[PDB]
Amino acid sequence: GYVPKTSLSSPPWPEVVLPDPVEETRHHAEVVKKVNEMIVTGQYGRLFAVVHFASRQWKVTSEDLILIGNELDLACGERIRLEKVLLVGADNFTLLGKPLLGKDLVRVEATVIEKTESWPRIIMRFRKRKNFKKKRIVTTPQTVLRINSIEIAPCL
Amino acid sequence: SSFSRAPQQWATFARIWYLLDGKMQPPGKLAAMASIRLQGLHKPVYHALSDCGDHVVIM
Amino acid sequence: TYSPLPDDYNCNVELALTSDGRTIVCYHPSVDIPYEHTKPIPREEGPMIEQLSKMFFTTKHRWYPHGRYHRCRKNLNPPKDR
Amino acid sequence: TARGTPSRFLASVLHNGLGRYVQQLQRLSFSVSRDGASSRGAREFVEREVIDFARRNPGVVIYVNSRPCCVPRVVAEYLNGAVREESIHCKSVEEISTLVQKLADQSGLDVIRIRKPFHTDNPSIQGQWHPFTNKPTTFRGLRPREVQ
Amino acid sequence: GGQWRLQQGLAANPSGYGPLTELPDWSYADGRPAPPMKGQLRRKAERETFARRVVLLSQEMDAGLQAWQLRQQKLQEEQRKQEN
Amino acid sequence: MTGKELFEMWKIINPMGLLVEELKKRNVSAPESRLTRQSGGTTALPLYFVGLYCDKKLIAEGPGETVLVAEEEAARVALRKLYGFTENRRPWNY
Amino acid sequence: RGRIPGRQWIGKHRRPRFVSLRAKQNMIRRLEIEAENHYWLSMPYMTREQERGHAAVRRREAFEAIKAAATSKFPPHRFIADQLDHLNVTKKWS
Amino acid sequence: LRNRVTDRYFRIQEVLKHARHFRGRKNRCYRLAVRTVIRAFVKCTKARYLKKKNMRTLWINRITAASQEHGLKYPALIGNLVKCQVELNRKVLADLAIYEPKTFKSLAALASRRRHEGFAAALGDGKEPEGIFSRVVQYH
Amino acid sequence: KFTRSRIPEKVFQASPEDHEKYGGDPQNPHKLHIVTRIKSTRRRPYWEKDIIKMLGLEKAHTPQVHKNIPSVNAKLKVVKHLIRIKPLKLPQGLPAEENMSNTCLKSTGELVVQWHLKPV
Ligand SMILES: [Mg+2]
């Protein structure tokens, strides 16, 4: 099945050889241990987190503010835990969920700072030459939350 | 990181100089690369209103 | 020896999976610029608009003034974030 | 519309949640009337709900003034100095209660368009992207086509 | 990439069924569970109605088959009885 | 002080001098300014990333419009790192 | 130059339309779906005789509910409490 | 003139207030201001769909920029992240690219890793062991 | 004239090749169809619109369970070009009253009776 070297004899892309599964799993374990030791020793500063709240994903950090477009049925100043954290990251390492990280791994806590109504939004419908004109004013409830802390535990 | 506000902004919105060599190169592919760089579409901070273009020198 | 991406720029990425395989760990320490990859520190309206355009690699149009309407429409106390 | 209206950025009065939550509302002045069908709901609210609300929110001073009025009103004064005046004219007890609770839970910041649904004072932890990130460095820092 | 999700058996839309959406979005810092989300309650009601309809249809079809079998019996032993 | 910068709160002059003094106290060789990266050197909008190297080891680097400004900002960055008030430092605990 | 007489897409001389590989693939995908539909419809569970009357009771009960809803249409009740509550519009204090 | 309108001033002002920032007589004459304001409100209503569409387009453009910086294409990055079962959306991906370049480099490395695992699986089609990252967590 | 289409019966007579391809045994046929409207009734005949409404497939991509009986099959044959039909599978059997509230219809067409939302 030999083919002389021509422009089309071999694919343009380079040939990649993935590491053997056994040695690669050993390396995986070593890297996980290293990152776990970093967490144990607290060798991280600010932590950010991609957290799925409401229906969206927010990139979040301690002291951050988030505007959820609805009432949450929570008294202002009440503390909450955001449970759907997709990603937690530090300066030197990041942990990715599949698709969600563990509760024992990540704890993101927020506080319901404010409950408000959005500024009036105009919904205008108009069709030319049909006497079709309509106007509506809508104020969507909103809650402002402040993300107090993002804590990680050595559970890798 | 840890930069002051003005230096950080300058570094982020600095315009870079790229060099293309057109010898035996298709003018269309050269133009595609040059247009991307000129628009700044190669920058993650790209926005049509940010004037994030970069200089392209084609020899 | 396999590396998904070159490690000569930005952080050195090392991917891993926890034993349960339910979470990916990424170790990406930043790469410092080698000292050898560094150099030592060295030690009228028409003509004006043409000079400015040459200096800043722009067109003449932006350097012309604007009317009072636009000047007073411009917001002098814009909201500031961060 | 947004272009015809002022806008601001999401913010808190004094980083209201970092150390401790502080109720931004501080004063509630209810101008009510002894007589007048407009302030019937206001009178019922003063009778049945204002005391409970006052004891629930000890940080808010409530001044109930009953004087001849055609349009009963509630004036909410917040810590940041904002004053919001609302009409409780011909509003039922439930409507007045919901309005008062909304004022209590609402901050003094202007109710205008908010440019971003989020506000970070430390957006970057790994370093904000600049053109020289993800760019390899060359030996002796030689720019392209440099001879020496 | 919904085709890959379909192949793996997940919802083509990640916003569909799955932990990412059906799990509670939050809980009290004390650990107390949050009240069920409105969307989750509606989805649970819809799945309950779907399951109840599935059961109803299957039971109706089984009952119809049993009734048809019983009718065929009745016919067979009748035919035999007036044959004898 | 949330969101504030070290030298936004504490005005200083001669950050290079402060850095030299601090490194002398910490028994580290005096920093060497070095041109790590540059762009548009001859233009009216240059960028200069200047790094401070001690014992051929990068301690910090800073951007600027001119080389002097870049060096001054790199000194500020090095001071922030030495004092542990980096932007990505551990957030205050409440 | 290059005019299409009259209106595009309607006249005798219409603007030519050409099928792209994208459209061909879309149509093929839909055809595959419909072929699978044919397969899954080609295997009935019960026969017509077996199904005869197996849902008659439920259908009759559903129509009985519909008829009851239709025939229960009748004006709502009226209450002295509702009539007298209007006197509260002039409720005052003392 | 038994009954006459006395609020016409305020009725006109309800529109002129929204028309104040227009150009020409459209900000002064009601006969013109009303038409312009109706058009402006209709545009504002219709602009929410375009706002969402343009936000997604901008996120895709920025993700493409970052992926090209790391040597990948946007389709490859997105598809391989999905295959890795990382459900980061385009907004968050663009935010990471702008503000967390090292995290985005890690994500691009993961996407390329999964892409190469898929290529290896296709090449050695059969019952060869599944790629380490290719393995999919199953939820029940 | 455009009229209602009479599909020849031979179209709905599966072959062994089809059985192998689609994984369905001619004996022991499936009891219930999962039907999803994947096509708009707009630009289609009013009779197809009415059949879709009868089957309750007004919302697109919303699965509906139907009996695999000749009459429902006739309606599905009428509107087959607008719908996707799959066999409902019950790996754990029919849901019981105890687990009626924990069911979920997975994209594979299986109505699992336990939905824990936890990794296996
Ligand atoms: Mg024409």
Curated annotation (Swiss-Prot), chain D:
Disulfide bonds: none
GO biological process, one term: mitochondrial translation
Gene Ontology terms: cellular component: mitochondrial inner membrane; mitochondrial large ribosomal subunit; mitochondrial ribosome; mitochondrion
Annotated localization: Mitochondrion
One function term, GO molecular function aspect: RNA binding
Expressing tissues: High relative levels in skeletal muscle and testis. Lower levels of expression in the heart, brain, placenta, lung, liver, kidney, pancreas, spleen, thymus, prostate, ovary, small intestine, colon and leukocytes. Expression is coregulated with TWNK.
Keyword terms, alphabetized: Mitochondrion, Ribonucleoprotein, Ribosomal protein, Transit peptide
Presence of keyword Ribosomal protein: yes
Family: Belongs to the mitochondrion-specific ribosomal protein mL43 family.
Subunit and partners: Component of the mitochondrial large ribosomal subunit (mt-LSU). Mature mammalian 55S mitochondrial ribosomes consist of a small (28S) and a large (39S) subunit. The 28S small subunit contains a 12S ribosomal RNA (12S mt-rRNA) and 30 different proteins. The 39S large subunit contains a 16S rRNA (16S mt-rRNA), a copy of mitochondrial valine transfer RNA (mt-tRNA(Val)), which plays an integral structural role, and 52 different proteins.
Protein name: Large ribosomal subunit protein mL43
Name of the gene: MRPL43
Swiss-Prot record, chain E:
Top-level lineage group: Eukaryota
Alphabetized UniProt keyword annotations: Mitochondrion, Ribonucleoprotein, Ribosomal protein, Transit peptide
GO molecular function annotation: structural constituent of ribosome
Cellular component terms per the entry's GO annotation: mitochondrial inner membrane; mitochondrial large ribosomal subunit; mitochondrion; nucleoplasm
Signal peptide: none
GO BP terms, alphabetized: mitochondrial translation; translation
Keyword Transit peptide in annotation: yes
Compositionally biased residues, Basic and acidic residues: 76-84
Localization of this protein: Mitochondrion
Binding partners and assembly: Component of the mitochondrial large ribosomal subunit (mt-LSU). Mature mammalian 55S mitochondrial ribosomes consist of a small (28S) and a large (39S) subunit. The 28S small subunit contains a 12S ribosomal RNA (12S mt-rRNA) and 30 different proteins. The 39S large subunit contains a 16S rRNA (16S mt-rRNA), a copy of mitochondrial valine transfer RNA (mt-tRNA(Val)), which plays an integral structural role, and 52 different proteins. mL52 connects the central protuberance to the body of the ribosome.
Family recorded in the similarity comment: Belongs to the mitochondrion-specific ribosomal protein mL52 family.
Protein name, entry field: Large ribosomal subunit protein mL52
Organism, as annotated: Homo sapiens
Curated annotation (Swiss-Prot), chain G:
InterPro entries attached to this UniProt entry: Ribosomal_mL63 (IPR016576)
Subcellular location: Mitochondrion
Entry annotated with the keyword Transmembrane: no
Keywords noted in UniProt: Mitochondrion, Ribonucleoprotein, Ribosomal protein
GO molecular function: structural constituent of ribosome
Predominant localisation class: mitochondrion
Recorded superkingdom: Eukaryota
One biological process term in Gene Ontology: mitochondrial translation
Any Gene Ontology CC annotation: mitochondrial inner membrane
PANTHER family: LARGE RIBOSOMAL SUBUNIT PROTEIN ML63 (PTHR14520:SF4), MITOCHONDRIAL RIBOSOMAL PROTEIN 63 (PTHR14520)
Subunit-structure text: Component of the mitochondrial large ribosomal subunit (mt-LSU). Mature mammalian 55S mitochondrial ribosomes consist of a small (28S) and a large (39S) subunit. The 28S small subunit contains a 12S ribosomal RNA (12S mt-rRNA) and 30 different proteins. The 39S large subunit contains a 16S rRNA (16S mt-rRNA), a copy of mitochondrial valine transfer RNA (mt-tRNA(Val)), which plays an integral structural role, and 52 different proteins.
Family: Belongs to the mitochondrion-specific ribosomal protein mL63 family.
Protein name: Large ribosomal subunit protein mL63
Gene name linked to the record: MRPL57
Curated annotation (Swiss-Prot), chain I:
Keyword Ribonucleoprotein: yes
Parts forming coiled coils: none
Compartment(s): Mitochondrion
GO molecular function: structural constituent of ribosome
Keyword list, A-Z: Mitochondrion, Ribonucleoprotein, Ribosomal protein, Transit peptide
Main location: mitochondrion
GO biological process: mitochondrial translation
Single GO cellular component term: mitochondrial inner membrane
Family: Belongs to the universal ribosomal protein uL30 family.
Quaternary structure and partners: Component of the mitochondrial large ribosomal subunit (mt-LSU). Mature mammalian 55S mitochondrial ribosomes consist of a small (28S) and a large (39S) subunit. The 28S small subunit contains a 12S ribosomal RNA (12S mt-rRNA) and 30 different proteins. The 39S large subunit contains a 16S rRNA (16S mt-rRNA), a copy of mitochondrial valine transfer RNA (mt-tRNA(Val)), which plays an integral structural role, and 52 different proteins.
Protein name (record): Large ribosomal subunit protein uL30m
Species in which this protein is naturally found: Homo sapiens (Human)
Lineage, uppermost ranks: Eukaryota, Metazoa, Chordata, Craniata, Vertebrata
Residues of the full protein shown: 35 to 154 of 161
